[PDB]
Design an enzyme around this catalytic site. Structure first.
Site, PDB file in Angstrom:
ATOM      1  N   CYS A 110     -11.154 -42.344 -11.485  1.00 53.52           N
ATOM      2  CA  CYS A 110     -12.535 -42.491 -10.762  1.00 53.52           C
ATOM      3  C   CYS A 110     -12.573 -43.657  -9.695  1.00 53.52           C
ATOM      4  CB  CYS A 110     -13.841 -42.587 -11.837  1.00 53.52           C
ATOM      5  SG  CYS A 110     -15.371 -42.599 -10.595  1.00 53.52           S
ATOM      6  N   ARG A 113     -15.995 -45.963  -9.057  1.00 51.16           N
ATOM      7  CA  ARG A 113     -16.370 -47.192  -9.907  1.00 51.16           C
ATOM      8  C   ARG A 113     -17.129 -48.481  -9.640  1.00 51.16           C
ATOM      9  NH1 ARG A 113     -11.110 -48.261 -13.035  1.00 51.16           N
ATOM     10  NH2 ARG A 113     -10.166 -47.013 -11.146  1.00 51.16           N
ATOM     11  N   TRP A 282     -21.924 -38.668  -7.163  1.00 52.48           N
ATOM     12  CA  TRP A 282     -22.430 -38.046  -6.119  1.00 52.48           C
ATOM     13  C   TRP A 282     -21.014 -37.518  -5.445  1.00 52.48           C
ATOM     14  CZ3 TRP A 282     -25.107 -42.944  -5.994  1.00 52.48           C
ATOM     15  CH2 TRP A 282     -24.163 -43.877  -5.512  1.00 52.48           C
ATOM     16  N   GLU A 287     -13.525 -33.506  -1.463  1.00 50.45           N
ATOM     17  CA  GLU A 287     -13.668 -33.036  -2.649  1.00 50.45           C
ATOM     18  C   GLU A 287     -14.127 -31.527  -2.105  1.00 50.45           C
ATOM     19  OE1 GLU A 287     -13.392 -32.853  -6.551  1.00 50.45           O
ATOM     20  OE2 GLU A 287     -11.757 -34.005  -5.346  1.00 50.45           O
TER      21      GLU A 287
HETATM   22  C1  HEM Z   1     -21.567 -42.415  -7.619  1.00 47.21           C
HETATM   23  C2  HEM Z   1     -20.540 -41.759  -7.125  1.00 47.21           C
HETATM   24  C3  HEM Z   1     -19.103 -41.578  -7.803  1.00 47.21           C
HETATM   25  C4  HEM Z   1     -18.102 -40.917  -6.948  1.00 47.21           C
HETATM   26  C5  HEM Z   1     -18.024 -40.989  -5.601  1.00 47.21           C
HETATM   27  C6  HEM Z   1     -17.261 -40.479  -7.857  1.00 47.21           C
HETATM   28  C7  HEM Z   1     -15.814 -39.764  -7.424  1.00 47.21           C
HETATM   29  C8  HEM Z   1     -14.828 -39.331  -8.357  1.00 47.21           C
HETATM   30  C9  HEM Z   1     -13.881 -38.782  -7.574  1.00 47.21           C
HETATM   31  C10 HEM Z   1     -13.639 -38.295  -6.261  1.00 47.21           C
HETATM   32  C11 HEM Z   1     -13.189 -38.138  -8.807  1.00 47.21           C
HETATM   33  C12 HEM Z   1     -11.896 -36.968  -8.776  1.00 47.21           C
HETATM   34  C13 HEM Z   1     -12.478 -35.656  -8.995  1.00 47.21           C
HETATM   35  C14 HEM Z   1     -11.485 -34.723  -9.055  1.00 47.21           C
HETATM   36  O1  HEM Z   1     -10.593 -34.566  -8.250  1.00 47.21           O
HETATM   37  O2  HEM Z   1     -11.447 -33.935  -9.884  1.00 47.21           O
HETATM   38  C15 HEM Z   1     -13.771 -38.740 -10.031  1.00 47.21           C
HETATM   39  C16 HEM Z   1     -13.220 -38.606 -11.331  1.00 47.21           C
HETATM   40  C17 HEM Z   1     -13.536 -39.136 -12.248  1.00 47.21           C
HETATM   41  N1  HEM Z   1     -15.065 -39.789 -12.335  1.00 47.21           N
HETATM   42 FE1  HEM Z   1     -16.136 -40.484 -10.660  1.00 47.21          FE
HETATM   43  N2  HEM Z   1     -17.369 -40.741  -9.184  1.00 47.21           N
HETATM   44  C18 HEM Z   1     -18.724 -41.172  -9.159  1.00 47.21           C
HETATM   45  C19 HEM Z   1     -19.610 -41.319 -10.342  1.00 47.21           C
HETATM   46  C20 HEM Z   1     -19.050 -41.103 -11.756  1.00 47.21           C
HETATM   47  C21 HEM Z   1     -19.545 -41.460 -12.878  1.00 47.21           C
HETATM   48  C22 HEM Z   1     -21.119 -42.029 -12.735  1.00 47.21           C
HETATM   49  C23 HEM Z   1     -18.783 -41.395 -13.851  1.00 47.21           C
HETATM   50  C24 HEM Z   1     -18.950 -41.344 -15.384  1.00 47.21           C
HETATM   51  C25 HEM Z   1     -20.018 -41.840 -16.008  1.00 47.21           C
HETATM   52  C26 HEM Z   1     -17.507 -41.048 -13.519  1.00 47.21           C
HETATM   53  C27 HEM Z   1     -16.508 -40.646 -14.000  1.00 47.21           C
HETATM   54  C28 HEM Z   1     -15.340 -39.981 -13.665  1.00 47.21           C
HETATM   55  C29 HEM Z   1     -14.176 -39.496 -14.511  1.00 47.21           C
HETATM   56  C30 HEM Z   1     -13.829 -39.675 -15.819  1.00 47.21           C
HETATM   57  C31 HEM Z   1     -13.321 -38.806 -13.598  1.00 47.21           C
HETATM   58  C32 HEM Z   1     -12.267 -38.117 -14.209  1.00 47.21           C
HETATM   59  C33 HEM Z   1     -12.490 -36.531 -14.227  1.00 47.21           C
HETATM   60  C34 HEM Z   1     -11.130 -35.887 -14.481  1.00 47.21           C
HETATM   61  O3  HEM Z   1     -10.045 -36.412 -14.801  1.00 47.21           O
HETATM   62  O4  HEM Z   1     -10.979 -34.551 -14.257  1.00 47.21           O
HETATM   63  N3  HEM Z   1     -17.659 -40.860 -12.101  1.00 47.21           N
HETATM   64  N4  HEM Z   1     -14.612 -39.166  -9.622  1.00 47.21           N
HETATM   65  C1  LIG Z   2       0.134 -31.996  -9.904  1.00 46.02           C
HETATM   66  C2  LIG Z   2      -0.710 -32.917  -9.602  1.00 46.02           C
HETATM   67  O1  LIG Z   2      -0.815 -33.985 -10.397  1.00 46.02           O
HETATM   68  C3  LIG Z   2      -2.255 -32.287  -9.495  1.00 46.02           C
HETATM   69  O2  LIG Z   2      -2.188 -30.955  -8.562  1.00 46.02           O
HETATM   70  C4  LIG Z   2      -3.277 -33.530  -8.971  1.00 46.02           C
HETATM   71  C5  LIG Z   2      -2.973 -34.674  -8.543  1.00 46.02           C
HETATM   72  N1  LIG Z   2      -3.835 -35.480  -8.045  1.00 46.02           N
HETATM   73  C6  LIG Z   2      -5.151 -35.370  -8.041  1.00 46.02           C
HETATM   74  N2  LIG Z   2      -6.041 -35.982  -7.488  1.00 46.02           N
HETATM   75  C7  LIG Z   2      -7.309 -35.674  -7.552  1.00 46.02           C
HETATM   76  N3  LIG Z   2      -8.340 -36.592  -7.478  1.00 46.02           N
HETATM   77  N4  LIG Z   2      -7.786 -34.619  -8.605  1.00 46.02           N
HETATM   78  C8  LIG Z   2      -6.807 -33.657  -8.717  1.00 46.02           C
HETATM   79  O3  LIG Z   2      -7.239 -32.520  -9.108  1.00 46.02           O
HETATM   80  C9  LIG Z   2      -5.556 -33.973  -8.636  1.00 46.02           C
HETATM   81  N5  LIG Z   2      -4.673 -33.250  -9.078  1.00 46.02           N
HETATM   82  O1  LIG Z   3     -16.987 -36.591 -12.238  1.00 48.44           O
HETATM   83  N1  LIG Z   3     -17.894 -36.861 -11.416  1.00 48.44           N
HETATM   84  O2  LIG Z   3     -19.096 -36.998 -11.874  1.00 48.44           O
HETATM   85  C1  LIG Z   3     -17.698 -36.824  -9.948  1.00 48.44           C
HETATM   86  C2  LIG Z   3     -18.453 -37.544  -9.268  1.00 48.44           C
HETATM   87  C3  LIG Z   3     -18.079 -37.450  -7.601  1.00 48.44           C
HETATM   88  C4  LIG Z   3     -17.421 -36.594  -7.226  1.00 48.44           C
HETATM   89  N2  LIG Z   3     -16.897 -36.199  -6.001  1.00 48.44           N
HETATM   90  N3  LIG Z   3     -16.230 -35.111  -6.015  1.00 48.44           N
HETATM   91  C5  LIG Z   3     -15.791 -34.938  -7.465  1.00 48.44           C
HETATM   92  C6  LIG Z   3     -16.695 -35.699  -8.329  1.00 48.44           C
HETATM   93  C7  LIG Z   3     -16.913 -35.908  -9.747  1.00 48.44           C
END
Ligand code: HEM
Ligand SMILES: C[C@H](O)[C@H](O)C1CNc2nc(N)[nH]c(=O)c2N1
Ligand SMILES: O=[N+]([O-])c1ccc2[nH]ncc2c1
Ligand code: HEM
Ligand SMILES: C[C@H](O)[C@H](O)C1CNc2nc(N)[nH]c(=O)c2N1
Ligand SMILES: O=[N+]([O-])c1ccc2[nH]ncc2c1
Lengths: 413, 413
Positions: A110, A113, A282, A287
């Protein structure tokens, strides 16, 4: 003693001491077993639970300017006692709040954070039925959406007890578009949700065969069978895509939901496991603009936006892709800003993350980070994160992935 | 048995069996010890050398449609005998050629690997002095450059014997611009070569205080002291930056050399070590356009190209950086194409790499790949490589990093 971490951009050095508190060459694997906490059909063995529980109670009470020792010792005792008499234990609301923020704080993947301490917790541990889950989820969606002024929130359902009575949302995200295998070979909508869309139909869901059909909540409660629920349309807020210079952009008829809410992850804290705890923050522009709209396995609108731009979409070297995707990103950002819906561009996100890391190292000497996930899908080296060396490691509390519920679920009918 | 590798873009699966032949969570570390083969002041212990040597002779003779067993057994015997009588052993020219291509083939960080079998080998194992090294390097530069029609080539100098007689180029790359700490606080030229530029001056080099001053070859031969040599200007081919629509681009007075030649890596093969073996391929657009011109720790021309484009260089959300860097990339590509100098854009590079991987898995079931290095510094998810899961692992032969020579070098004067 520690581990030197260099930032090739500023030249700055850092010393990681936090990695010692981790658990246990698989490079770019998306779902590595190390990041997954699967099913179990027997309670957490007391010898394992008791130690993890204490560590957590020490972590909790160990974090505060003015530490109250009495309450600490007392909690330690009452917790052990509770484990002795009941097997498992119940966290105080205060502890849960602390757990959820820490688990987020410890999310390697994330980028948002810096916001870690700014989270709303909805305690649904009293929940017992699918219809009650559906109501809590609706409450969540409504609170998080806040009419475009998005708020980060999490809803915690009952912890896993024996493992056979698991509370689980079958959806990947709360709001998510449907994808159907059209007659003429083509795919319509979100090709990524193809397999799950079929499932919803199988459970009796009316498929509206469109490009942006919000999928239904597939809820599983207390180990029971998953019940389908359509999300009240008034609750799902969407943004219509619109370019600030290309009047032909709206003609593409694009849009996306404003709520990015992860729904299928498990929260692990003090030996306890919460299999259902959807959360949201948000969106970060790229994304939607890059992954959702541009991946070939998604809406794949890149060649489409290409030709309408006049670009040589037949010559890779012309860098037409670098041109289109950037304008698509501009559309997304412009559209969310105009319609008063929270969103952050990736550059800004990266900067705040860097500030976060600096805060994390000063406060606790470390910040579990996954470079492969933190670097934006566009403008890699343009963002400061690309130049920062970083250590990846699973701490605790933590948000784990789970085995897709439809695989390990003993049906009843 | 194997390891499943998924390509989230095409959905294709692959089985890696090649990782079993490797050697021995450090995420985004640039120079990890695992990728470095440092100094030694004693020969390679016979018990170690003999086994590695045999494995290599088996690999070599094991690769051919029509395998000649006699020659194989004979080579095995003659090699062991040679090791018995001399300690170390000498590779046949044919073996060396095979070694260099394999080592390249096994380069986790190289995207150009589809070209692996198309390499020219310059055998300078007879070399004995700095002046002779300088001549071989010049021969290299002239052959590689080929008046813009770049050719991949490598020059192999004498292998490490006891470790005290090491042949080493002190430069990072053959052609590389200088960087000086200007009076008025600012940095001029390539800020990355600041420390090494100072060294060249210390060894008596006339600093021409400019933005594009080609640095001198700092050669070390047979353990002796490093001698400085200025590269004959006629040999160094450069490209003048020019945008195809922005006539103000040339006014920036930019240019870059056409020869990307890695100079300080060690070649390890069959237990043998070659501390000096510079090699080169041809540039990939983004290298110059994004890293060289846009990193803040380099020429940092991004804000400069921004304002001259009219962009809101004061509002991150405007994505002006995504706009500028793309036009800079266009300039580079356009300028190399116009001046008839080989170059490949990143999209095209990524595609060829994917074809490479497919060839590698079919031929040997694996392809050591470093995702962090293979994904371009721009247009991440737009290239197919981003979606390909990949395994990183050090095989053999292999190109290792070395400890910066000026650290571990006992001076004589
Ligand atoms: C407030 C704005 C926040 C932003 C801008 C943000 C942004 C992001 C982004 C861009 C990713 C990658 C998503 C993807 O490519 O699938 C991500 C992943 C993640 N975020 Fe955040 N996040 C926010 C809040 C949160 C909150 C509130 C939590 C948890 C309470 C959180 C937990 C995580 C987790 C666990 C992942 C991993 C998901 C996965 O592995 O598929 N995020 N976040
Ligand atoms: C193969 C590769 O690990 C995969 O396509 C990835 C890599 N990095 C990424 N980065 C973010 N944030 N979300 C994703 O889905 C992925 N996927
Ligand atoms: O995990 N989330 O809550 C979360 C928060 C913000 C994000 N932006 N793009 C994907 C995404 C996921
Ligand atoms: C023919 C064209 C070639 C292309 C397009 C290509 C491209 C690349 C690129 C883009 C990188 C990353 C460079 C960086 O960011 O520092 C790289 C690294 C590398 N390449 Fe290639 N390459 C080519 C030929 C070669 C050859 C001929 C060899 C060796 C004989 C080779 C060996 C390597 C090695 C070892 C690295 C790693 C360098 C490091 O870790 O700093 N390449 N290549
Ligand atoms: C910190 C990070 O590992 C570092 O800045 C990287 C990452 N990936 C890279 N990719 C390539 N090709 N070349 C590089 O210099 C780097 N550097
Ligand atoms: O290592 N190399 O020979 C080599 C080859 C091609 C390259 N493009 N950009 C950097 C680079 C380096």
């Amino acid at each position: 003693q520690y581990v030197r971490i260099k930032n090739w951009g500023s030249g700055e050095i850092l010393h990681d001491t936090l990695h010692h508190k981790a658990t246990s060459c698989l490079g770019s694997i998306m779902n590595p077993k190390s990041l997954t906490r699967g099913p179990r059909d027997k309670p957490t063995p007391l010898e394992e639970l008791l130690p993890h529980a204490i560590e957590f109670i020490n972590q909790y009470y160990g974090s505060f300017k003015e530490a109250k020792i009495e309450e600490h010792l007392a909690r330690l005792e009452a917790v052990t006692k509770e484990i002795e008499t009941t097997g498992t234990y119940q966290l105080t609301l205060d502890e849960l709040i602390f757990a959820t923020k820490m688990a987020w704080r410890n999310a390697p993947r994330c980028i948002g954070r810096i916001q870690w301490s700014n989270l709303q917790v909805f305690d649904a541990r009293n929940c017992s039925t699918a219809q009650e889950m559906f109501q809590h989820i609706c409450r969540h969606i409504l609170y998080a959406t806040n009419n475009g002024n998005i708020r980060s929130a999490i809803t915690v359902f009952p912890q896993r007890s024996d493992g056979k009575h698991d509370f689980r949302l079958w959806n990947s995200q709360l709001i998510r578009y449907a994808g159907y295998q059209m007659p003429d070979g083509t795919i319509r909508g979100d090709a990524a949700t193809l397999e799950f869309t079929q499932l919803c139909i199988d459970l009796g869901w009316k498929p509206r065969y469109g490009r942006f059909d919000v999928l239904p909540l597939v809820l599983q409660a207390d180990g029971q069978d998953p019940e389908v629920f359509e999300i009240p349309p008034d609750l799902v807020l969407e943004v219509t895509m619109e370019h600030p210079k290309y009047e032909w952009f709206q003609e593409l008829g694009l849009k996306w939901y404003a709520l990015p809410a992860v729904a299928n992850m498990l929260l692990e804290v003090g030996g306890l496991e919460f299999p259902a705890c959807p959360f949201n923050g948000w969106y970060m522009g790229t994304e939607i603009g890059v992954r959702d709209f541009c991946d070939t396995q998604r809406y794949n609108i890149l060649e489409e936006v290409g030709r309408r731009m006049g670009l040589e979409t037949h010559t890779l070297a012309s860098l037409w892709k670098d041109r289109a995707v950037t304008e698509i990103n501009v559309a997304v950002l412009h559209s969310f800003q105009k319609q008063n819906v929270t969103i952050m561009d990736h550059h800004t996100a990266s900067e705040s993350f860097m500030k976060h890391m600096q805060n994390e190292y000063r406060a606790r000497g470390g910040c579990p980070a996954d470079w492969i996930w933190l670097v934006p899908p566009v403008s890699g080296s343009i963002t400061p994160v690309f130049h920062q060396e970083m250590l990846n490691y699973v701490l605790s509390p933590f948000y784990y992935y789970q085995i897709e519920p439809w695989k390990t679920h003993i049906w009843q009918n």
